[PDB]
Amino acid sequence: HELTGQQLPEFEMVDQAGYQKKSAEFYNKPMLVVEWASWCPDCQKQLPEIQKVYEKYKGKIHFVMLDMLDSKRETKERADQYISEKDYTFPYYYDTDERAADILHVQSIPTIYLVDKNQKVKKVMTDFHDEAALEKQLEE
Numbered sequence: 481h482e483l484t485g486q487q488l489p490e491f492e493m494v495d496q497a498g499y500q501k502k503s504a505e506f507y508n509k510p511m512l513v514v515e516w517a518s519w520c521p522d523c524q525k526q527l528p529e530i531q532k533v534y535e536k537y538k539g540k541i542h543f544v545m546l547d548m549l550d551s552k553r554e555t556k557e558r559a560d561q562y563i564s565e566k567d568y569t570f571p572y573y574y575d576t577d578e579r580a581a582d583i584l585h586v587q588s589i590p591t592i593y594l595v596d597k598n599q600k601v602k603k604v605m606t607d608f609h610d611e612a613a614l615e616k617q618l619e620e
Contacts, residue, residue, distance in 0.1 A: 482585060483593070483601040488513075491580035493547055493573035501573065503580075504599070509543040510618065511595035515575065515586045517549045518562035523590045525608060527568070530592075532611040533618075534570040541618060547575035549589065594618070 483489070488511075491503045514530060516523040534544050548559055556574065563572060575581055584593070594603035594617055609617060 481604065484604050486601050488593075488595060488599045488601060489583050491583045492576075493545070493580060494576055495571070495573050503545070506543065507599065508597070510541045510597050511543045511545055511593070511599065512618075513545040513547065513584070513593035513595060515547050515549070515581050515584060515589050515591045517554045517589050518558055519553050520589050522608065526590050526592075528566070529609065529611045529614055531566075531568055531570060533614045536611075536615065537618065543595075544570045546570060546572040547580050547584075548572065549578045549581055549586075550574065550576055 488503060493501050493503070495501050512530075512533075514526075516527060518524070530544070530546075538544075548554065559572075559574070578586070581589075584591070588606055590606075592605040592609070592614075593601055594605065596602050603617060605617070
C-alpha cells in the first residue's frame with residue numbers, strides 16, 4: 481500500500497551487459513516494476529502473462545523493469561536458465577541482494593508496480609492478474 485500514490489523510491493539494478501542501471505535514467509513511458517524470483521510458484525504463474533503483456537506493449541507503452549531477488553535460494557545461473565527455458569523476450573535485471581526490494585518494501589513476490597508516465601506509483605498488485613487483467617490495468 482505505502483507506495484500507492486507516491487513517487488518511485490530511488491533504486492538500482494544490474495542488467496545483462498554487466499552494467500549497473502539507475503531507476504531514474506529511463507522516462508517518457510509508463511513503467512511496470514515487477515519483483516520476481518524463479519523459484520517462486522506465483523512468479524512462475526504470473527511471468528508468462530507479463531510475457532504476453534510485453535510483446536503487446538513493447539510498441540505502445542514499453543518499460544518493463546523486472547528485478548530479481550538474491551542470492552541464496554535464487555542465483556544468477558538459476559536465473560538465466562529459467563528465462564531461457566521458458567523463452568522470455570522481456571529485458572530483466574538483477575536486484576542485487578534484494579536491495580531494490582528492500583527499498584520497494586517487497587514482502588511477497590511477485591509484486592507488480594503500475595507506474596504512470598511521470599514516475600508516480602499508481603497501483604501495487606500482489607495478486608494474480610493474467611494478461612487481459614494486466615492489459616486492462618494499464619488502460620486504467
